[PDB]
Amino acid sequence: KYKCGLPQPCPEEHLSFRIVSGAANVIGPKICLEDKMLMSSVKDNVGRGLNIALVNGVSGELLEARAFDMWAGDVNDLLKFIRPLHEGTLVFVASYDDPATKMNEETRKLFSELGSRNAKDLAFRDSWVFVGAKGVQNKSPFEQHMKNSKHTNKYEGWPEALEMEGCIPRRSIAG
Numbered sequence: 001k002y003k004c005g006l007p008q009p010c011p012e013e014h015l016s017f018r019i020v021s022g023a024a025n026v027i028g029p030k031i032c033l034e035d036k037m038l039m040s041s042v043k044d045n046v047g048r049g050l051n052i053a054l055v056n057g058v059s060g061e062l063l064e065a066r067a068f069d070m071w072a073g074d075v076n077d078l079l080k081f082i083r084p085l086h087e088g089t090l091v092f093v094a095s096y097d098d099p100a101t102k103m104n105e106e107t108r109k110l111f112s113e114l115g116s117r118n119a120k121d122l123a124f125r126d127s128w129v130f131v132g133a134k135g136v137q138n139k140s141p142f143e144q145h146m147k148n149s150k151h152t153n154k155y156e157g158w159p160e161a162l163e164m165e166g167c168i169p170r171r172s173i174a175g
């Protein structure tokens with residue numbers, strides 16, 4: 001195993017990452033970058049809702065990681081966290097339990113501008129993992145979504161946890 005437990009390394013200056021979303025309302029998510037856990041139950045920084053790590057796209061430094069309660073939290077807290085990002089900031093997102101109840105149109109639009117295809121349709125108890133970036137042009141290649149649906153839900157009441165891994169190119173110091 002290589003960085004973050006991937007089966008292959010990420011060469012050419014790329015950042016290795018792995019995200020696992022939550023399982024129902026009992027197993028928290030985790031976000032790994034370059035073999036370091038940005039968010040996990042061991043770091044004790046995850047919670048129900050959206051678990052978001054903001055990362056410098058040049059250095060890979062963690063700027064901040066926070067969980068946002070999407071059931072009872074004020075969505076303006078989430079919005080203040082994700083709106084004023086510098087160009088190239090990477091945005092790692094893992095849902096836990098319910099990512100959607102407090103999401104509003106402004107939040108869906110901002111995630112879309114960060115590269116999300118699934119934010120526009122996110123609904124109660126969906127599973128979602130996503131890596132976006134401030135200034136991305138096309139949609140992100142790192143996004144998975146599972147709808148909360150009784151026919152397919154792994155759990156009584158919730159969809160399965162998602163696992164996503166990959167290699168992210170570094171931004172240059174140019175500019």
Ligand SMILES: CC(=O)O[C@H](C)C[N+](C)(C)C
Nearest residue numbers: 115131132133136140168
């Ligand atoms: C700038 C741009 O392009 O962005 C980056 C590459 C990141 N992701 C995550 C989206 C992949």
